[PDB]
Amino acid sequence: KLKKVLDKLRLKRKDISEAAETVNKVVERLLRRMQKRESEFKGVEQLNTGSYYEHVKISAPNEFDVMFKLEVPRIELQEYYETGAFYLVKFNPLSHFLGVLSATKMLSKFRKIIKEEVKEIKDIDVSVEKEKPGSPAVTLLIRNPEEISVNIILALESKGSWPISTKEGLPIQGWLGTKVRTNLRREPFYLVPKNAFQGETWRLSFSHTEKYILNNHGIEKTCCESSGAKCCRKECLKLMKYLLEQLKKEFQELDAFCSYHVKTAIFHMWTQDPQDSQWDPRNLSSCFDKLLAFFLECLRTEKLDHYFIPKFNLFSQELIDRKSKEFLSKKIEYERNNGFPIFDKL
Amino acid sequence: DKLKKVLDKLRLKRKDISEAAETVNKVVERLLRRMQKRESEFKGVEQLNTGSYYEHVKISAPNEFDVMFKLEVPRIELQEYYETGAFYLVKFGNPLSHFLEGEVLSATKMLSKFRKIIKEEVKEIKDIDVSVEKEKPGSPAVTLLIRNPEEISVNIILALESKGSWPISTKEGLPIQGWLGTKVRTNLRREPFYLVPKQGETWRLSFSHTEKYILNNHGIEKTCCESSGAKCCRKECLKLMKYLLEQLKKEFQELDAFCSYHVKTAIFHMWTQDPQDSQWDPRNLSSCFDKLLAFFLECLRTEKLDHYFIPKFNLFSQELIDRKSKEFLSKKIEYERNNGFPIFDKL
DNA sequence: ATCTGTACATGTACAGAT
DNA sequence: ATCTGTACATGTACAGAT
DNA sequence: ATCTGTACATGTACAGAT
DNA sequence: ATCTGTACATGTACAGAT
Ligand SMILES: Nc1nc2c(ncn2[C@@H]2O[C@H](COP(=O)(O)OP(=O)(O)OP(=O)(O)O)[C@@H](O)[C@H]2O)c(=O)[nH]1
Numbered sequence: 001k002l003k004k005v006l007d008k009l010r011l012k013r014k015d016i017s018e019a020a021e022t023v024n025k026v027v028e029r030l031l032r033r034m035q036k037r038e039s040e041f042k043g044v045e046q047l048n049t050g051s052y053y054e055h056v057k058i059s060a061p062n063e064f065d066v067m068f069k070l071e072v073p074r075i076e077l078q079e080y081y082e083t084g085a086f087y088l089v090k091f092n093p094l095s096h097f098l099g100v101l102s103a104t105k106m107l108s109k110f111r112k113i114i115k116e117e118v119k120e121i122k123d124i125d126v127s128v129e130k131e132k133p134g135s136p137a138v139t140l141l142i143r144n145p146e147e148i149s150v151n152i153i154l155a156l157e158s159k160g161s162w163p164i165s166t167k168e169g170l171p172i173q174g175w176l177g178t179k180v181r182t183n184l185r186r187e188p189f190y191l192v193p194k195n196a197f198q199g200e201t202w203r204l205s206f207s208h209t210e211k212y213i214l215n216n217h218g219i220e221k222t223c224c225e226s227s228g229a230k231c232c233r234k235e236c237l238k239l240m241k242y243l244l245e246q247l248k249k250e251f252q253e254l255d256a257f258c259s260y261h262v263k264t265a266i267f268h269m270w271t272q273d274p275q276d277s278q279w280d281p282r283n284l285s286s287c288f289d290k291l292l293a294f295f296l297e298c299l300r301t302e303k304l305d306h307y308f309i310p311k312f313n314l315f316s317q318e319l320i321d322r323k324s325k326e327f328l329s330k331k332i333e334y335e336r337n338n339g340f341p342i343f344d345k346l
Numbered sequence: 347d348k349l350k351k352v353l354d355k356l357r358l359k360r361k362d363i364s365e366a367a368e369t370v371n372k373v374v375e376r377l378l379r380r381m382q383k384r385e386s387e388f389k390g391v392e393q394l395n396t397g398s399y400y401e402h403v404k405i406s407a408p409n410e411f412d413v414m415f416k417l418e419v420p421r422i423e424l425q426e427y428y429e430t431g432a433f434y435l436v437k438f439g440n441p442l443s444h445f446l447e448g449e450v451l452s453a454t455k456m457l458s459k460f461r462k463i464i465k466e467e468v469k470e471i472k473d474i475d476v477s478v479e480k481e482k483p484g485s486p487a488v489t490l491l492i493r494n495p496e497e498i499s500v501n502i503i504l505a506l507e508s509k510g511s512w513p514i515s516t517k518e519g520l521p522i523q524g525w526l527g528t529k530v531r532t533n534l535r536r537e538p539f540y541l542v543p544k545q546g547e548t549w550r551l552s553f554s555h556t557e558k559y560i561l562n563n564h565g566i567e568k569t570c571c572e573s574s575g576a577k578c579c580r581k582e583c584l585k586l587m588k589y590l591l592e593q594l595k596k597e598f599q600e601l602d603a604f605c606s607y608h609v610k611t612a613i614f615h616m617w618t619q620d621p622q623d624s625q626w627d628p629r630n631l632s633s634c635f636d637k638l639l640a641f642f643l644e645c646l647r648t649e650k651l652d653h654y655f656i657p658k659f660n661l662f663s664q665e666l667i668d669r670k671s672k673e674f675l676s677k678k679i680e681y682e683r684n685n686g687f688p689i690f691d692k693l
Numbered sequence: 694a695t696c697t698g699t700a701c702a703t704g705t706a707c708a709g710a711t
Numbered sequence: 712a713t714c715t716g717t718a719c720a721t722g723t724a725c726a727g728a729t
Numbered sequence: 730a731t732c733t734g735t736a737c738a739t740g741t742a743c744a745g746a747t
Numbered sequence: 748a749t750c751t752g753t754a755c756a757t758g759t760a761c762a763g764a765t
């Protein structure tokens with residue numbers, strides 16, 4: 001039933017190989033250009049993030065997210081309108097981009113560089129997608145076997161302690177524990193040029209922390225290892241991502257929703273239900289169902305807090321209209337009470 | 347439990363911890379500073395705190411501290427000393443030339459210089475009453491005897507640090523896969539390994555750093571013994587077993603061949619056999635201690651206790667401990683066990 | 694002026710003291 | 712239950728070195 | 730500063746066993 | 748049907764060499 005859906009969603013080994021060798025060629029070349037030139041971004045390092053590198057990509061290997069992170073010292077941070085997630089950054093290579101380090105100016109140069117290197121690539125069919133305003137990504141479209149998108153995300157790396165707004169976030173104490181949380185919070189934090197001073201605004205990223213959690217998700221150390229037993233936590237994430245993707249293809253009414261909403265929700269569930277035995281593979285139906293119910297509670301209450309930044313409600317009225325949330329509840333309730341017809345279509 | 351009251355006696359006092367640590371840290375820091383002067387041969391050596399006090403299983407007074415002075419030693423090839431598994435020769439104006447004899451890094455020559463340096467710095471200390479203990483042959487330690495309120499021993503252990511992959515003899519060791527898991531084991535084995543001085547050119551592997559990690563990360567659940575987790579009694583069992591041996595050892599010289607490392611090794615095997623946190627519930631302290639005793643007894647009677655890291659090395663081989671010694675220790679453990687542990691009442 | 698090995702600054706788990 | 716000393720990891724300031 | 734080599738985790742594929 | 752064992756594939760950390 002749901003096993004058969006996961007069978008459909010499973011990536012093929014062949015497709016993984018072909019997509020990765022092409023993706024890696026392009027990425028490596030872009031990364032070399034950023035450094036083996038006296039560009040402003042000399043020093044950037046690659047950080048592979050998001051679903052393909054977390055092993056929760058579904059359907060096909062057609063979307064890759066790579067952070068190019070740049071270490072930069074000092075960095076005074078000023079919280080933007082108590083959003084929790086948005087900041088202005090303050091004071092060398094980066095002179096060209098300011099009082100205040102302008103996200104847009106810096107992203108613009110990053111983008112320009114990337115576009116130029118892409119023009120110089122003759123051995124692969126690869127263009128740069130038209131820019132989405134306010135978006136932190138430079139997005140590459142590759143062809144050949146298949147359509148493949150690659151999001152190149154510029155990121156500031158700071159080694160200071162995480163901003164105050166995150167103090168009460170990452171509530172993993174009863175699940176992964178205090179030692180894990182203390183150590184995760186000793187890692188650097190990241191700032192991505194998302195923008196709401198809207199053009200100078202940056203947004204926090206915890207993509208690195210999320211990756212660690214996806215690959216270290218059990219209360220037992222052996223969860224999902226070769227001498228442990230297999231959770232169905234990841235499988236539930238896949239099923240929920242797929243239900244939203246399918247609904248999103250059909251209804252433009254759901255444009256404001258994205259996979260990060262589902263990722264966030266399941267982090268909350270994984271915290272609510274820390275035991276590995278509450279995610280037994282034999283209870284895949286119940287587990288999926290309790291996740292659906294939780295997401296619906298989030299929709300009904302108009303409340304889904306950033307897992308890392310609790311004051312930031314991703315389902316605030318300001319970000320998603322009530323109407324949209326009620327529409328999505330209708331559609332989830334329906335699939336749920338009719339055996340998920342939408343899992344059968346293409 | 348009678349055993350809760352024993353642990354109450356064994357519990358270290360914060361006051362005593364403070365006083366001992368203030369002095370120990372002063373001495374160690376000064377010894378460590380001196381090691382990085384006048385281009386001594388040990389310049390670069392770094393401090394690694396290890397053993398029971400740093401693992402929080404020191405019992406009944408904070409009077410013995412173990413600190414490794416470890417020195418990164420890059421290009422080195424190892425030759426196993428007669429298939430022992432644990433003993434090696436080390437080979438390559440390098441600083442350590444002064445201890446070489448035909449490509450072979452002499453343990454005793456290097457330890458001798460280390461020792462000499464330490465003795466000199468100790469003479470220069472006027473703050474505190476501290477002498478250097480007479481050398482025990484084949485011991486890797488330079489041992490300091492301090493007296494502030496009371497007697498405190500500090501073992502300064504010279505150590506070579508290699509960053510290569512661990513020696514072959516350890517491949518099947520550290521069998522933590524069903525307990526702490528494969529990711530933990532892979533990562534542990536990416537840490538360096540250590541060589542300490544044990545004929546006179548022979549060195550011995552140390553895993554004191556790995557043992558410390560395991561003692562402080564000992565559960566199958568990540569929250570074992572944490573503030574939002576459940577308490578286990580693994581460390582309490584280790585303390586009771588250490589205490590039974592200590593008490594027996596101070597009364598009977600027949601037990602000179604036994605040491606606390608035997609009980610640490612045994613309990614690592616038990617922790618592997620019984621991985622679940624629920625098999626070390628605080629409420630089941632008696633059973634848990636008792637099963638540990640029974641296992642140790644089987645080790646004694648069958649003359650088999652393998653090094654946790656080096657499986658082919660039997661710490662209870664006939665060549666290391668006479669049968670008579672092992673039978674003597676079994677009778678004494680059997681006795682304590684069947685008569686209410688009277689030795690826990692002593693002194 | 695700039696650079697750096699050493700020591701301090703900050704944060705918290707662990708476990709003893711209350 | 713809460714408070715508190717030691718150990719330990721990482722970040723950052725700086726007298727002395729360059 | 731940059732690159733390879735090694736080791737093993739996380740995957741997918743499929744036969745034979747259950 | 749599911750599980751177990753082997754084979755084949757990629758990603759990732761870090762040592763040692765350059
Ligand atoms: N690794 C990583 N990728 C990110 C991050 N933020 C955004 N991205 C990528 O950038 C893409 C677009 O970012 P969004 O935040 O959706 O930005 P947008 O399209 O301007 O705006 P929305 O309509 O708000 O989605 C995402 O789909 C990811 O590929 C981040 O913090 N880390």
Ligand SMILES: Nc1nc2c(ncn2[C@@H]2O[C@H](COP(=O)(O)OP(=O)(O)OP(=O)(O)O)[C@@H](O)[C@H]2O)c(=O)[nH]1
Pocket residue numbers: 396397412413414482483484485486487501503542551552553554605
């Ligand atoms: N941290 C640490 N300390 C060690 C190590 N090996 C020995 N020591 C310390 O040095 C002391 C002496 O080591 P032993 O192996 O007992 O040497 P010995 O007593 O001469 O020899 P035995 O007769 O085999 O006991 C130990 O009790 C510890 O205090 C090691 O690998 N790491």
Ligand SMILES: Nc1ncnc2c1ncn2[C@@H]1O[C@H](COP(=O)(O)OP(=O)(O)OP(=O)(O)O)[C@@H](O)[C@H]1O
Pocket residue numbers: 049050051052056057058063065204205206207208210241258259260263
């Ligand atoms: N609004 C957001 N706030 C914070 N981080 C975000 C946000 N959107 C995306 N991210 C981060 O960027 C990564 C890439 O986002 P993306 O939208 O590609 O999804 P994904 O997690 O890779 O899943 P999929 O690509 O299959 O939909 C996420 O995994 C997450 O770490």
Ligand SMILES: Nc1ncnc2c1ncn2[C@@H]1O[C@H](COP(=O)(O)OP(=O)(O)OP(=O)(O)O)[C@@H](O)[C@H]1O
Pocket residue numbers: 396397398399403404405410412551552553554555557605606607610
């Ligand atoms: N024979 C040995 N082989 C290998 N490592 C050993 C050996 N003896 C001791 N060690 C290591 O040296 C450390 C210090 O040894 P020591 O004899 O002080 O015991 P301990 O573990 O500190 O317990 P305690 O000192 O309270 O009896 C041990 O923790 C262990 O890591």
Ligand SMILES: [Mg+2]
Pocket residue numbers: 050051052063064065
């Ligand atoms: Mg993605």
Ligand SMILES: [Mg+2]
Pocket residue numbers: 397398399410411412
């Ligand atoms: Mg000791």
Ligand SMILES: [Zn+2]
Pocket residue numbers: 564565570571576577578579580
């Ligand atoms: Zn525990």
